[PDB]
Ligand binder design. Structure first.
Ligand SMILES: COc1ccc(N(CC(F)(F)F)S(=O)(=O)[C@@H]2C[C@@H]3O[C@H]2C(c2ccc(OCc4ccccc4)cc2)=C3c2ccc(O)cc2)cc1
Ligand SMILES: COc1ccc(N(CC(F)(F)F)S(=O)(=O)[C@@H]2C[C@@H]3O[C@H]2C(c2ccc(OCc4ccccc4)cc2)=C3c2ccc(O)cc2)cc1
Lengths: 212, 223
């Protein structure tokens, strides 16, 4: 590579991610969600092109990452919006839903409870917006990386590049924590807690697809 | 909890001590093996610091959520020194093409193999492996369960495993930047393990074939 992305400071990485953030959009229940998600996806495509390192990949690889990540990204967005609304999911400012409404749809209450659990966890952790954008990028680059067909040298160099950008996001995350005054022990602990939640996000996403 | 008061070196030794033993129609063979492994897993889980401190409901929930990921990461670890092959048992080493005998298995096999090479490329150590495996047990179920105090305890043990992981890396001579990076790479692979597990279940359902139930998990816990 000649990647401008690998040369960014932590502060530059955050600013670029903050700049790239989509707006909050306004809203059958499946109909409402589908309408919303559809409109969100257009923003997501455009947002992904602005995640440092993403455009350095081939189109096949960009699309693979997006195909693998799109629901988790929708989901983490939802969770972040819902944080200051305990017991409720803020799909849109004009569409705030409690658990019991998840019931109207087959299999959805389970996914809703999971979404709510993730929201409280973030809430208990006092997740910051700067952390959130970092996590969302991680999901984009990480979710798909392990399932490109891994022969062609090209395909091999794409994975290394992704692993490097991710190490940059890790560093970025650590820097925010350091700047926020957290000790080293606290820094490594919070980093672990954050990344471990991504595994629950993956699960929610898979369960969702299975229900579908 | 005596469990939360362990040093990093004590945590590793205790995890190393607790490690289950490694021997094997193909679905029959694998099911037979996995079933026998599960009994050992229950035993091993009781020895993961913090696990017994939980109620039976919570222990069973964690196991129900984790059992396949744990079987899978064990398989991956065994297979590391056998590139292109999965070592289900010392008498049952399988290549990609044999995954094909079962509908939908070759996909999961390719994923399993990918994970194995990644570990191989990262030079994953046994001390790291046991830490990751414990993380999977405590983490996979925690988000989907008194019940409030159970989660804090689990979060505390997990912070201990994080610390333990960092300590091994420090002792191995890695810089701070390198430490935080390797920790992240390891934990990010857990997300792929979760996915493999879910995909597996999905394919299993798509192909009856009985799976371990909550009930079955609770029977064994009680024995
Ligand atoms: C399409 O894939 C789907 C895969 C899973 C599902 N689920 C519902 C269930 F199936 F599990 F019940 S779920 O996992 O619970 C998922 C959680 C939540 O409910 C789902 C739903 C949703 C619905 C339709 C959709 O259509 C997207 C789309 C775009 C373009 C064309 C057509 C459709 C995308 C998401 C939510 C959501 C919407 C916007 C957000 O910002 C965040 C969350 C639905 C379709
Ligand atoms: C049972 O759930 C299943 C969920 C997934 C599947 N797959 C096959 C496919 F369907 F995807 F093709 S897979 O993802 O490729 C999975 C990878 C690997 O091949 C499968 C198999 C296995 C088979 C039967 C079983 O029964 C467990 C059991 C125990 C006691 C009572 C009832 C059941 C558990 C695991 C492997 C394995 C076995 C022992 C290890 O130490 C490590 C890995 C099969 C059943």
């Amino acid at each position: 590579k000649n990647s401008l992305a690998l040369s960014l400071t932590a502060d530059q990485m955050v600013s670029a991610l903050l700049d790239a953030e989509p707006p909050i959009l306004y809203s059958s229940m499946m109909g409402l969600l589908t309408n919303l998600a559809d409109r969100e996806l257009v923003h997501m495509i455009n947002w992904a092109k602005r995640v440092p390192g993403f455009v350095d990949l081939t189109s096949h690889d960009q699309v693979h990452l997006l195909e693998c990540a799109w629901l988790e990204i929708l989901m983490i967005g939802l969770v972040w919006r819902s944080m200051e609304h305990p017991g409720k999911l803020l799909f849109a400012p004009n569409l705030l839903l409690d658990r019991n409404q998840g019931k109207c749809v087959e299999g959805m209450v389970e996914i809703f409870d999971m979404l709510l659990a993730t929201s409280s966890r973030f809430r208990m952790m006092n997740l910051q917006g700067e952390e959130f954008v970092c996590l969302k990028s991680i999901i984009l680059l990480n979710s798909g990386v392990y399932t490109f067909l891994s022969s062609t040298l090209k395909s091999l160099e794409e994975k290394d590049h992704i692993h490097r950008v991710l190490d940059k996001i890790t560093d970025t995350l650590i820097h925010l924590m350091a700047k926020a005054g957290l000790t080293l022990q606290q820094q490594h602990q919070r980093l672990a807690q954050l990344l471990l939640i991504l595994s629950h996000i993956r699960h929610m996403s898979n369960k969702g697809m299975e229900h579908l």
